[PDB]
Amino acid sequence: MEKTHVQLSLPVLQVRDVLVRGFGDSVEEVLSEARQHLKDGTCGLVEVEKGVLPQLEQPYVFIKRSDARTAPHGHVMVELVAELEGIQYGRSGETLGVLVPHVGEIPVAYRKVLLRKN
Numbered sequence: 038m039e040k041t042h043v044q045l046s047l048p049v050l051q052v053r054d055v056l057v058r059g060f061g062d063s064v065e066e067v068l069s070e071a072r073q074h075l076k077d078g079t080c081g082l083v084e085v086e087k088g089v090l091p092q093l094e095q096p097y098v099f100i101k102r103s104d105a106r107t108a109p110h111g112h113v114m115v116e117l118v119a120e121l122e123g124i125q126y127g128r129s130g131e132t133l134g135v136l137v138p139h140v141g142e143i144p145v146a147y148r149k150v151l152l153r154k155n
């Protein structure tokens with residue numbers, strides 16, 4: 038059965054390499070698809086800098102920091118928050134990046150996270 042949190046190492050992708058630039062067309066769909074890709078090992082992370090979000094597709098799925106002393110086993114505790122037309126669905130901490138499908142792009146790094154499944 039599902040533990041509340043799972044340790045994952047996410048590939049960090051450069052925005053110009055990403056082939057599939059979002060998870061879907063509604064807040065509920067992108068959160069659902071992001072969770073499925075995380076379970077399947079087919080999710081990447083793009084770090085947000087100027088110019089990144091306009092090169093990706095809304096709705097966005099962000100991973101955000103969920104606490105301050107929980108970095109168990111070297112993995113930052115995180116949760117999912119979606120954004121569409123400037124409104125956020127969830128409230129959480131600082132953004133670590135934006136999640137996208139991973140379809141074989143070569144990463145530049147890995148980001149260790151402890152992900153709250155729901």
Ligand SMILES: Nc1n[nH]c2cccc(Cl)c12
Nearest residue numbers: 039043072073075076154
């Ligand atoms: N990463 C995940 N492994 N297993 C899951 C089940 C539900 C939701 C998620 Cl995100 C996961």
